[PDB]
Amino acid sequence: FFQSIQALMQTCSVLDLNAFERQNKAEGLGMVNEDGTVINRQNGEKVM
Amino acid sequence: SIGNIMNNKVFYQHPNLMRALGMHETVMEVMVNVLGGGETKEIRFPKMVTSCCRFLCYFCRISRQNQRSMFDHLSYLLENSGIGLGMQGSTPLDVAA
Amino acid sequence: ACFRMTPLYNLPTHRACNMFLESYKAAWILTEDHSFEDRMIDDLSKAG
Amino acid sequence: KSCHLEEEEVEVSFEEKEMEKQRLLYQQSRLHTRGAAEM
Amino acid sequence: HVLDVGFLPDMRAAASLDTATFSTTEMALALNRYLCLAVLPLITKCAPLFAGTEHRAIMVDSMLHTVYRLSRGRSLTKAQRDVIEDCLMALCRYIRPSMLQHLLRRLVFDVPILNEFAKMPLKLLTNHYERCWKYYCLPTGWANF
Amino acid sequence: SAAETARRTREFRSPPQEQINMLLHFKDEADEEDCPLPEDIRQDLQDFH
Amino acid sequence: MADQLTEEQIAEFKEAFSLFDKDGDGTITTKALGTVMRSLGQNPTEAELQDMINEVNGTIDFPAFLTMMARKMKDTDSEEEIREAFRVFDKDGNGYISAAALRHVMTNLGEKLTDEEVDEMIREAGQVNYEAFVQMMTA
């Protein structure tokens, strides 16, 4: 059990910066040519 | 079977069906079973990976959401792609690109 | 692109229905049934 | 959710606040005696 | 750089006549002539451009002989904008057209140099009259026009 | 009234899916209603739902 | 992609393909691609065909034929999409639109354009012609 707790928390993420830039230009676009706009909208899965 | 799939006039008008039936999911395991082998000597049953990987590429060039749905398996695809090299027509690396 | 985005009144009937169902995920996802939560552990388990 | 249901406002009196921490203590009491917790 | 790139361009219409099997040279005209048609930097003290000027015209000789309606525009726009950079000394290039441009005045190859000729007169309506045979060639073309 | 043209924007702009969201939001919503429909087709939902 | 076309060109293209198909395989020769386009009104000269097979063996299958008509239709539609996109801007239709008319109808089009982006848009360019608006959109 303590193997799991020790290993698991070492895979936790931190505030990365490189991934932040990938949002900062991806958010520049507002809608696809014609497909329901950006379906993911927030798409928060990146920084944390 | 796959050759008759790409002539039915319906796998061009309603892509939303084919992600709901998800045949791209099922056909994916077909490739992994035949290619599963220890080394390059396990290239049993060729001429079918090429005959099927061609179908995957055209599926990826029908809509943007079709591109996303199969993109998520990129890490899975490259894991078993750079081993069986030497044939023509297609290879799993091509559909990865 | 934003000017050629066709009007709604030219869509085929079959296609103009699938968009309704997918978009009408705005009456289940927000409504709450509650129900099975407190009546579950009551009739089940306790008084079993 | 079967436990934490009870888990700009007047001050809470001292008789009522035990009812919450007793109801909470009982709501999960049935859920640790009955095996559970050791899973 | 033109003393090495034009060496390959020297074999322009060296096969554009009989049959020309491997037309991969036309594929090299999609990343070379396009790069040359992006530099208005031109001076003097040389006449090697004259060999290159006709070479582009020699490549545009084929009106349909392996050109592609889309790939033909690259070579057409390669010279149409190459005129506004020369030192107004385009000598033999005018004589290359002369009346041959006036000839076939009912073909699709007419608009190849028709609009190109108008660009010369619209940039010399107060000069470029310091010649002789060219001045005679202008009237020779004007009367035949 | 000029500005009425600004109000009527879903009707020609936005993709078709966006129009459905605007016209369907108030139907099965509660209390507040914006850009509503006639109060004749907004009754069957409150019966069907 | 291939979603630029409706159902009704695709059902027409399979109607043309299955009419002149050899045995139901989905195969045609390098002659039959010419006769299958002149059967529908479209009359290209042989350079237009000459690049598309070099683009795609002698066996032209139905996904290969569908991708070649999609590129043959999208290039003229992408050249003509922008004039009918210009038509709601001006009331008459010749191409002359007011500058005071353009700041409430272009901030409200549904791409979440603020007041700042159309303010950058028109002062990096009274009434302006139609061919300048393509010159200022494609840039």
Curated annotation (Swiss-Prot), chain E:
It is found in: Sarcoplasmic reticulum membrane. The N-terminus is blocked. Channel activity is modulated by phosphorylation. Detected in skeletal muscle (at protein level). Fast- or slow-twitch skeletal muscle. It comes from the Eukaryota. Cytosolic calcium-activated calcium channel that mediates the release of Ca(2+) from the sarcoplasmic reticulum into the cytosol and thereby plays a key role in triggering muscle contraction following depolarization of T-tubules. Repeated very high-level exercise increases the open probability of the channel and leads to Ca(2+) leaking into the cytoplasm. Can also mediate the release of Ca(2+) from intracellular stores in neurons, and may thereby promote prolonged Ca(2+) signaling in the brain. Required for normal embryonic development of muscle fibers and skeletal muscle. Binding of [3H]ryanodine indicates that the heterozygous channel is activated by Ca(2+) concentrations 4-fold lower than normal. Single-cell analysis of cotransfected cells shows a significantly increased resting cytoplasmic Ca(2+) level and a significantly reduced luminal Ca(2+) level. Homotetramer. Can also form heterotetramers with RYR2. Identified in a complex composed of RYR1, PDE4D, PKA, FKBP1A and protein phosphatase 1 (PP1). Repeated very high-level exercise decreases interaction with PDE4D and protein phosphatase 1 (PP1). Interacts with CALM; CALM with bound calcium inhibits the RYR1 channel activity. Interacts with S100A1. Interacts with FKBP1A; this stabilizes the closed conformation of the channel. Interacts with CACNA1S; interaction with CACNA1S is important for activation of the RYR1 channel. Interacts with CACNB1. Belongs to the ryanodine receptor (TC 1.A.3.1) family. RYR1 subfamily. The calcium release channel activity resides in the C-terminal region while the remaining part of the protein constitutes the 'foot' structure spanning the junctional gap between the sarcoplasmic reticulum (SR) and the T-tubule. Pore opening is mediated via the cytoplasmic calcium-binding domains that mediate a small rotation of the channel-forming transmembrane regions that then leads to channel opening. This is Ryanodine receptor 1. The gene is RYR1. The chain holds residues 2520 to 2664 of 5037 of the full protein.
Swiss-Prot record, chain G:
GO terms for cellular component: calcium channel complex; calyx of Held; catalytic complex; centrosome; cytoplasm; cytosol; extracellular region; myelin sheath. Ca(2+) 3 binds at residues 90, 92, 94, 96, 101. This is Calmodulin-1. (Microbial infection) Inactivated by S.flexneri OspC1 and OspC3 proteins, which specifically bind the apo-form of calmodulin, thereby preventing calcium-binding and activity. CDD domains: EFh. There is a cross-link at residue 22 (Glycyl lysine isopeptide (Lys-Gly) (interchain with G-Cter in SUMO2)). It comes from Homo sapiens. The modification Phosphotyrosine is found at residues 96, 130.
